Write a protein that binds this ligand. Structure first.
Ligand SMILES: CC/C=C/[C@@H](OC(N)=O)[C@@H](Cl)[C@H](O)CC(=O)[C@@H](O)[C@H](O)[C@H](C)/C(Cl)=C/C=C/C=C(C)/C=C/C=C/C(=O)O[C@@H]1C[C@@H](C(=O)O)CC[C@@H]1O
Ligand SMILES: Nc1nc2c(ncn2[C@@H]2O[C@H](COP(=O)(O)OP(=O)(O)NP(=O)(O)O)[C@@H](O)[C@H]2O)c(=O)[nH]1
Ligand SMILES: [Mg+2]
Length: 372
C-alpha cells in the first residue's frame, strides 16, 4: 500500500481536530476490511487507510503562537487538507497557513468547507467557496482546480450517514488529487529523527519518515549530527498497528536500536547507512531571500545576521558571512553566503533548508558546498 503523508491546517477552531477524528472513524467503519505505534506516539499523528492507500496524518493546531510546530510537518506533507468553516469563512490563520504552505512548497491543497450543518443558504456557501478559491489563487495555488468538499466533521463523527458520505468524498480526493509520490528506494538509507521514546525491555525507538533507502532488521546504522557520530544496530521496525522487517522510503516508522540510551539520541539527528553522510558546521549556499510580496522581511539584513536554519526535522542558529564587498542583503535578492552553525548537522551538497527569524520565513536555500 503506497504511503502518503497529509494533514489538517486552517484557522483556530474551524474543525481540524474533529475532521481528523471523523476521517479515521468513517474510513474504519466503511472500508474496515497491537501495541505498535511508530509515529502515532505523537498525539497529533494518526494513520488511516483508503481502499488503495495508507495515510500518515498530522493534525496541526491553528493558533499563530504555534506556527513553528507545523513547519517541519508541512515540509514533509505530500498534500494538505485546508479546513475552512462555512460560518466564519476565511480568517487570519487561514491566510497564514496557506502562506506557510506555499513557502515550504506543499505541492497540493484540498479544501474541506466545514460546519455546513450550521449553514442552509446555498448562496452563502457559493460565496464562501468563491473567496476560498481567490485566497488560494492569491498565494499561487490552483484556486480554480482546487477540490472543495462541503461537509460537517461533527455530524459525520457522530454517525450521520448523509454527512459521513462527505468524508468519503474527501478521502476520494486524497486518493485522486494527490499523485502517488516517488520514492528514492535505490539510495543509501537515511531517516531524520523526530521523536525518540524508550520502551521498557526493548531499547530505544526513534521515529520519522524514511527519506530514502531501506533499513532492515539486523543492519547497522549511524546516528549523525549535533552530537558525536554514534553507531548502532536496527533491532526492529514498527508502524501503527503492526511490526515489520523493513522500513522503506516514503514510510513513517519507528526504529528500535540496540545499545543506545534514550538520552543519547535527539531530534534533528539522522539515522543512516554507515559512512554515507557526514556532520558539518560550515557550508556555502545559494539562498533566495523572500520579498515582502511573499511574506519575507521588509528591510535588508547585514553581516552577522543570526537567524534559525531549518534542516529536516530540526532548526539551528547560524551566522552568515557575505560575499566580499557586499554590505547588505535586500528582500528579494538571491545570494551566496557562507553559513556557520552553532552545532553540526548531517548534510551534503543539495540539501534544502529554510531560514526563519523574528516570527517569519526569511529565506529558502540549498547547500551548495559543504566545508566544516
Ligand atoms: C526542513 C525545512 C525545509 C524547508 C523546505 O521545504 C521542503 N519541503 O524541503 C523549503 Cl526551504 C522549500 O525547499 C522551498 C521551496 O521549495 C521553494 O520553491 C519556495 O517554496 C519558494 C522559494 C518560495 Cl519561499 C516561494 C514563496 C512564494 C510566496 C507567495 C506567492 C506569497 C504570496 C503572498 C500574497 C499575499 O497577499 O500576501 C499577504 C501580503 C504580503 C505583503 O505583500 O505585504 C505579506 C504576507 C500576506 O500574507
Ligand atoms: N457545528 C459544527 N461544529 C463543529 C464542526 N467541526 C468542529 N466543530 C466544533 O467547533 C469546535 C472546534 O473544533 P476542533 O476540531 O477542536 O477545532 P480545531 O480547528 O482543531 N482547533 P485548534 O486550531 O485549536 O486546533 C468544537 O466545539 C467542535 O465541536 C462541524 O462540522 N459542525
Ligand atoms: Mg485542533
Amino acid at each position: 500500500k503506497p504511503h502518503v503523508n497529509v494533514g489538517t491546517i486552517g484557522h483556530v477552531d474551524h474543525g481540524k481536530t474533529t475532521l481528523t477524528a471523523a476521517i479515521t472513524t468513517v474510513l474504519a467503519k466503511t472500508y474496515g476490511g497491537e501495541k505498535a505505534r511508530g509515529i502515532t506516539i505523537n498525539t497529533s499523528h494518526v494513520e488511516y487507510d483508503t481502499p488503495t492507500r495508507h495515510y500518515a496524518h498530522v493534525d496541526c493546531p491553528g493558533h499563530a503562537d504555534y506556527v513553528k510546530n507545523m513547519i517541519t510537518g508541512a515540509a514533509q506533507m505530500d498534500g494538505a487538507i485546508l479546513v475552512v468553516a462555512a460560518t466564519d469563512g476565511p480568517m487570519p490563520q487561514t491566510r497564514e497557513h496557506i502562506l506557510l504552505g506555499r513557502q515550504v512548497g506543499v505541492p497540493y491543497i484540498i479544501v474541506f468547507l466545514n460546519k455546513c450543518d450550521m449553514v442552509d443558504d446555498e448562496e452563502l456557501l457559493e460565496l464562501v467557496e468563491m473567496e476560498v478559491r481567490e485566497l488560494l489563487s492569491q498565494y499561487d495555488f490552483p484556486g480554480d482546480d482546487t477540490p472543495i468538499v462541503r461537509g460537517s466533521a461533527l455530524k459525520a463523527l457522530e454517525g450521520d450517514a448523509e454527512w459521513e458520505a462527505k468524508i468519503l468524498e474527501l478521502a476520494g480526493f486524497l486518493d485522486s488529487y494527490i499523485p502517488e509520490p516517488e520514492r528514492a528506494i535505490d539510495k543509501p538509507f537515511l531517516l531524520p529523527i523526530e521523536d525518540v521514546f524508550s520502551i521498557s525491555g526493548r531499547g530505544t525507538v526513534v521515529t520519522g519518515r524514511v527519506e530514502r533507502g531501506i533499513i532492515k532488521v539486523g543492519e547497522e546504522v549511524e546516528i549523525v549530527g549535533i552530537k558525536e557520530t554514534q553507531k548502532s544496530t536496527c533491532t526492529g521496525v514498527e508502524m501503527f498497528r503492526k511490526l515489520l522487517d523493513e522500513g522503506r522510503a516514503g514510510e513513517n516508522v519507528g526504529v528500535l536500536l540496540r545499545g543506545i540510551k534514550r538520552e543519547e539520541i535527539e531530534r534533528g539527528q539522522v539515522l543512516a547507512k554507515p559512512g554515507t553522510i557526514k556532520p558539518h558546521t560550515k557550508f556555502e549556499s545559494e539562498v533566495y531571500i523572500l520579498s515582502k510580496d511573499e511574506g519575507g522581511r521588509h528591510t535588508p539584513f547585514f553581516k552577522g545576521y543570526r537567524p534559525q536554519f531549518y534542516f529536516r526535522t530540526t532548526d539551528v542558529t547560524g551566522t552568515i558571512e557575505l560575499p566580499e564587498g557586499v554590505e547588505m542583503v535586500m528582500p528579494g535578492d538571491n545570494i551566496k553566503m557562507v553559513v556557520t552553525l552553532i552545532h553540526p548537522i548531517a548534510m551534503d551538497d543539495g540539501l534544502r533548508f529554510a531560514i526563519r527569524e523574528g516570527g517569519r520565513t526569511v529565506g529558502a536555500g540549498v547547500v551548495a558546498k559543504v566545508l566544516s
